[PDB]
C-alpha cells in the first residue's frame, strides 16, 4: 500500500561507455599517415593496447592494416616516415625523460 517503495527499473545514471579513438571509423591499409602514429619512430614496433588505448576490434584491425601495408609497398618497416613524423601524439609512451 506504500507509494514510496522503490520500483525495479533500469539505472538512469548509467554513464556512456568509453570509446576507442577509432570507434565507428574506417581503418585502411592505404592511410600510412594514420598507421604511422601507432608505430615507434625509432624502431618501428607496433604499440600494444596499454600504449594505444583502443578497444578490442580496432587494435587487431590496425595491426592487420600495418602488416598489410608493410608488405604491399606503402609503409617502411624499420622506421617511421619523417614526413609523418610530425603527426600529433596519440600514443601514451614517453621516451625522452
Amino acid at each position: 500500500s506504500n507509494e514510496d517503495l522503490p520500483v525495479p527499473m533500469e539505472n538512469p545514471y548509467k554513464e556512456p561507455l568509453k570509446k576507442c579513438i577509432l570507434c565507428e571509423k574506417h581503418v585502411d591499409y592505404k592511410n600510412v599517415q594514420l598507421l604511422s602514429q601507432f608505430i615507434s619512430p625509432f624502431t618501428g614496433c607496433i604499440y600494444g593496447r596499454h600504449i594505444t588505448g583502443l578497444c578490442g576490434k580496432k587494435q587487431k584491425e590496425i595491426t592487420k592494416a600495418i602488416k598489410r601495408a608493410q608488405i604491399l609497398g606503402f609503409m617502411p618497416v624499420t622506421y617511421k616516415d619523417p614526413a609523418y613524423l610530425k603527426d600529433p601524439k596519440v600514443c601514451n609512451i614517453k621516451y625522452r625523460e
Binding site: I21, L22, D28, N31, L34, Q37, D87, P88, K89, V90
Partner: protein, 49 residues
C-alpha cells in the same frame, strides 16, 4: 534500391571508349587517403596545407 544505386554507377564505369579519357584524367587528378587522428577523437587532414 541497390539495383538503382548500381544503375547510377553504371554511367561512370571505365569502358573502351572511356579508356583514353580516364587514363589522362587519372594522370592529372591525384588523390590522397592520408588522414590523421587526435586524442579527442577528431580527424585532421593534410590537404589544407
Amino acid at each position: 534500391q541497390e539495383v538503382l544505386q548500381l544503375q547510377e554507377e553504371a554511367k561512370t564505369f571505365i569502358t573502351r571508349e572511356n579508356l583514353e579519357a580516364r587514363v589522362e584524367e587519372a594522370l592529372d587528378s591525384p588523390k590522397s587517403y592520408n588522414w590523421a587522428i587526435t586524442r579527442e577523437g577528431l580527424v585532421v587532414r593534410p590537404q589544407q596545407k
